[PDB]
């Protein structure tokens, strides 16, 4: 039984965004919605086996905010290059026409942890049946993230996952068809 | 390009054999650079770069802090394992196996944990095999495509299966 | 539903 539990937290400027999540063997256990101040379980079935007072996370965050100001003054506010993500799109299961499936947009090896993602069906943004994850930690300093698109496989529709980051010159789009 | 400033911390609880041997690793990152560590095997803070030195100086001079730190291997790392060992550790999701020709393809999807063995039988074939590798789905399930170059049986072994699955 | 433990962030400066 060789396992790893990771309490990953951070604060980012100038976006003024924070995060507090837990990680088990690479998968998110939960995170805390800072604005709504509540524990969001990655899988709904987790709630029956454990609990976490969200207050602690907001507290840590506030301290992260404080520490960040410290770190900025210590380094003379010395900025650093951005690291652009590698985007990959693939279905969750073997794709069958007419059979409900799921598209996975995988954004990996990037930082800072802030990106805008847009699902495109036939060039048009999609706001229905779209899920996303918070910024997940890797072994290294860089981040990871998943976006999900619910769909019905047809030969007429084509999809794109558009990812915008400060490390990129222009928004990066990865394509996917049934062909 | 555009400047950014990240205070990033990872508090890692490692378990070599369940609660047998537990290790706490606190890792501090600023922007792209890891600058400070607390390894429970060392019991002290250790800067990784110039930037983490002041912190190392400060916290290591706080006896009670270091004291409470060393205890967190038990107060936090042990405490949590006993909790997760109830649902996370013993998690098992059976894989779904499908064979189809694009070059024959064995599709092993929707399974947990990650460890799995996918073998091609023609007698077993150790040639003309390429795979996407293990792919994490982000939702506590894995998937992988193992393909046999042909011009046929697919066997799957996994902790969720008492007996192996075939084609 | 036991309560999960966590490290309280430490003060810098």
């Amino acid at each position, epitope marked *: 039984e060789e396992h790893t539990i990771i309490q990953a937290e951070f604060y980012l400027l100038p976006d003024k965004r924070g995060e507090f999540m837990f990680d088990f063997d690479g998968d998110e256990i939960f995170h805390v919605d800072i604005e709504k101040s509540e524990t969001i379980w990655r899988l709904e079935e987790f709630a029956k086996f454990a609990s976490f007072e969200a*207050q602690g996370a*907001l507290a840590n965050i506030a*301290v992260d905010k*404080a520490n960040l100001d410290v770190m900025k003054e210590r380094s003379n506010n010395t900025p650093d290059a951005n690291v652009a993500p590698e985007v990959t799109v693939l279905s969750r299961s073997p794709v069958n026409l007419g059979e409900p499936n799921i598209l996975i947009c995988f954004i990996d090896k990037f930082s800072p942890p802030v990106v805008n993602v847009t699902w495109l069906r036939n060039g048009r943004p999609v706001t229905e049946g779209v899920s996303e994850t918070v910024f997940l930690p890797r072994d290294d300093h860089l981040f990871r993230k998943f976006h999900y698109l619910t769909f019905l496989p047809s030969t007429d529709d084509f999809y794109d996952c558009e990812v915008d980051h400060w490390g990129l010159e222009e928004p990066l789009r990865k394509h996917w068809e049934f062909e | 390009s555009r400047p950014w400033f990240l205070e990033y911390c990872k508090s890692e609880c490692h378990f070599y054999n369940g609660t047998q041997r537990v290790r706490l690793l606190v890792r501090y990152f600023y922007n792209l650079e890891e600058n400070l560590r607390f390894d429970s095997d060392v019991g002290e803070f250790r800067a990784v770069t110039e930037l983490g030195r002041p912190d190392a100086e400060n916290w290591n001079s706080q006896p009670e*802090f270091l004291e*409470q730190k060393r205890a*967190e291997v038990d107060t936090v790392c042990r405490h949590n394992y006993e909790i997760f060992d109830n649902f996370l550790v013993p998690r098992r999701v059976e894989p779904t196996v499908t064979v189809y020709p694009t070059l024959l393809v064995c599709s092993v999807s929707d399974f947990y944990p990650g460890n799995i063995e996918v073998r091609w039988f023609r007698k077993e074939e150790k040639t003309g095999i390429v795979s996407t590798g293990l792919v994490r789905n982000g939702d506590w399930t894995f998937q992988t495509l193992v393909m046999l170059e042909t011009v046929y049986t697919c066997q799957v072994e996994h902790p969720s299966l008492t007996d192996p699955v075939t084609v | 539903a036991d*309560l*999960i433990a966590y490290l309280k962030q430490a*003060t810098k400066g």
Partner: T-cell receptor, first 114, second 107 residues
Framework: MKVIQTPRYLVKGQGQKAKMRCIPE?????VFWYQQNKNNEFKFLIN????????QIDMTEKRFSAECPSNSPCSLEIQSSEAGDSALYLC????????????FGSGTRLLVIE | QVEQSPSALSLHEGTGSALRCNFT?????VQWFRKNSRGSLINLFY???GTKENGRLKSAFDSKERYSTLHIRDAQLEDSGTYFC???????????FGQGTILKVYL
């Protein structure tokens, strides 16, 4: 220094605001406020690291007003005193938010009368 | 929650006894205070593990077994007052107190 609370005693009629002052140890950024009654039962009210609130209860949010202004003593003010606000208000400081090594002050003994 | 025993104690000079705190969960550490006649909480102990001796008092703490003890030896008038144990569950930023022990040293 040490945790210094003033006034050591306080008395107010219902409806009046009752302010309480607290000065943490030297170099102690974290400040806590607890409430203890005559039955020796304690209740966490609010928590600070320097100027920013780390956590508070629902009561403190509505009925209390608390600050830790820079270069200034942390304060805790009841906006409209009730008989049930009568208790000992303990303030405690800490060096490190990670740490659980708290130092309590003398406290302020508030009494609310008609 | 914290079960602190006992409720009250009377000790003739130069005698000894023990206080105890039992916990219903994992604490990050423990702390013992003494409220003197003034009502000022004198800090007595902090410990996240093991034991500590400070004069005529010694304290122990075992987070796994969820208990802490405060021993007093060679009691003196100055020892009178109400003793309290206090601990943070490792799941919170908040402290929890015992009911306290009223100690009284008979001269």
């Amino acid at each position: 220094m040490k945790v210094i609370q003033t006034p050591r005693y306080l008395v107010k009629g219902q409806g009046q605001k009752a302010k309480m002052r607290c000065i943490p140890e030297k170099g102690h950024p974290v400040v806590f406020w607890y409430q203890q009654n005559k039955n020796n039962e304690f209740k966490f009210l609010i928590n600070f690291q320097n100027q920013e609130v780390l956590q508070q209860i629902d009561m403190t949010e509505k009925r209390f007003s608390a600050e830790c202004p820079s270069n200034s003593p942390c304060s805790l003010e009841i906006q409209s005193s009730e008989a049930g606000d009568s208790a000992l208000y303990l303030c405690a400081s800490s060096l490190n938010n990670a740490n659980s090594d708290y130092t309590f002050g003398s406290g302020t003994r508030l009494l609310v009368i008609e | 929650q914290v079960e602190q025993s006992p409720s009250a104690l009377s000790l003739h000079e130069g005698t000894g006894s023990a206080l105890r705190c039992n916990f219903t969960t994992t604490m990050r550490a423990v702390q013992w205070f003494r409220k003197n006649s003034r009502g000022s909480l004198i800090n007595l102990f902090y410990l996240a593990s093991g034991t500590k001796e400070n004069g005529r008092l010694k304290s122990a703490f075992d987070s796994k077994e969820r208990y802490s003890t405060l021993h007093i030896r060679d009691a003196q008038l100055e020892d009178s007052g109400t003793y309290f144990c206090a601990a943070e569950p490792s799941s919170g930023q908040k402290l929890v107190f015992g009911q306290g022990t009223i100690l009284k040293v008979y001269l």
